[PDB]
Structure formats: structure tokens, C-alpha cells
């Protein structure tokens, strides 16, 4: 159970990784053009922030004691997949009317949320080896 969580969170870690990256390249993706390219981002986002609180929150929790170190790093991928879908709620296509109004508010709802999540995780005896080696095994 415990160390099967590593192999669990590991996977959670670089999948993070991964929605970070889809985030970032329709953003850049449309730059030079998209209608739909937002709306992928935006319902997809939905799903993926609902299936942070209803599973990788509660395992977080589970190993959180064990192994500090996968899990603040677990919780540093998670804070920046979430700097990314805030920039993505308030943005420039977002300013065209209609489509895009019937998704922003359902994905705000639920960041604010799992934001919240990572707060009292953020504050349990704050210390700079839990952060440090989330950070060189973060690397890539």
C-alpha cells in the first residue's frame, strides 16, 4: 500500500506534466488562430480538475505522511497546471461572445476548490527538503 504509492504518484506527477503541456500549446496554438482550440481546454479541464479532488486528493492525503517528498511535488505540479487554467478562464477569445461563457464558471467553481486543497497542504510544518527535492526530481 505504501509502496505501491510511490509507483502511483510518479505517474500522477509527469500526467500533471502532461496537461500542463496540452495547456500551454493551445495557448500558443491560438495565437495565430482557434475557435475550438479553447473549447477543448475548457471542457476537458472540468473533467480533469473533478478527477484531482475525487482521486489524487485523497491518496495525497493517504501517502502525505509517508513520502514528503512525491507528494509536495505532486502538489507543485498541481499549482502550476492551475496558474494555467486561471489564465485560461479570463482570456482574449474569451472576450468573443457566447460559446465560451457556458464553461468558465463551472471550471472557476471547482478550482477554487482544489486551490483550496493545496492550501492546508501548502501549511503543515512548512519545510525547505520537502520542497527542495519535489523541486531536482521535478526537473523533468
Same mark, same amino acid.
Given at each position: 500500500?505504501?509502496?505501491?504509492?510511490?509507483?502511483?504518484?510518479?505517474?500522477?506527477?509527469?500526467?500533471?506534466?502532461?496537461?500542463?503541456?496540452?495547456?500551454?500549446?493551445?495557448?500558443?496554438?491560438?495565437?495565430?488562430?482557434?475557435?475550438?482550440?479553447?473549447?477543448?481546454?475548457?471542457?476537458?479541464?472540468?473533467?480533469?480538475?473533478?478527477?484531482? $479532488?475525487?482521486?489524487?486528493? @485523497? /491518496? #495525497?492525503?493517504? &501517502?502525505?505522511?509517508?513520502?514528503?517528498?512525491? =507528494?509536495?511535488?505532486? *502538489?507543485?505540479?498541481?499549482?502550476?497546471?492551475?496558474?494555467?487554467?486561471?489564465?485560461?478562464?479570463?482570456?482574449?477569445?474569451?472576450?468573443?461572445?457566447?460559446? $465560451?461563457?457556458?464553461?468558465? @464558471? /463551472? #471550471?472557476?467553481? &471547482?478550482?477554487?476548490?482544489?486551490?483550496?486543497? =493545496?492550501?492546508?497542504? *501548502?501549511?503543515?510544518?512548512?519545510?525547505?527538503?520537502?520542497?527542495?527535492?519535489?523541486?531536482?526530481?521535478?526537473?523533468?
Amino acid at each position: 500500500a505504501a509502496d505501491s504509492q510511490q509507483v502511483h504518484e510518479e505517474k500522477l506527477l509527469y500526467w500533471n506534466m502532461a496537461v500542463r503541456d496540452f495547456s500551454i500549446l493551445l495557448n500558443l496554438m491560438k495565437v495565430f488562430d482557434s475557435y475550438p482550440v479553447l473549447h477543448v481546454c475548457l471542457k476537458y479541464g472540468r473533467r480533469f480538475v473533478e478527477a484531482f $479532488l475525487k482521486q489524487c486528493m @485523497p /491518496l #495525497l492525503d493517504f &501517502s502525505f505522511r509517508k513520502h514528503r517528498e512525491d =507528494v509536495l511535488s505532486l *502538489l507543485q505540479t498541481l499549482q502550476l497546471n492551475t496558474r494555467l487554467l486561471h489564465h485560461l478562464c479570463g482570456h482574449s477569445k474569451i472576450r468573443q461572445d457566447t460559446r $465560451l461563457t457556458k464553461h468558465v @464558471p /463551472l #471550471l472557476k467553481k &471547482s478550482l477554487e476548490l482544489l486551490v483550496c486543497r =493545496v492550501k492546508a497542504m *501548502l501549511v503543515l510544518n512548512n519545510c525547505r527538503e520537502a520542497f527542495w527535492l519535489g523541486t531536482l526530481k521535478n526537473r523533468d
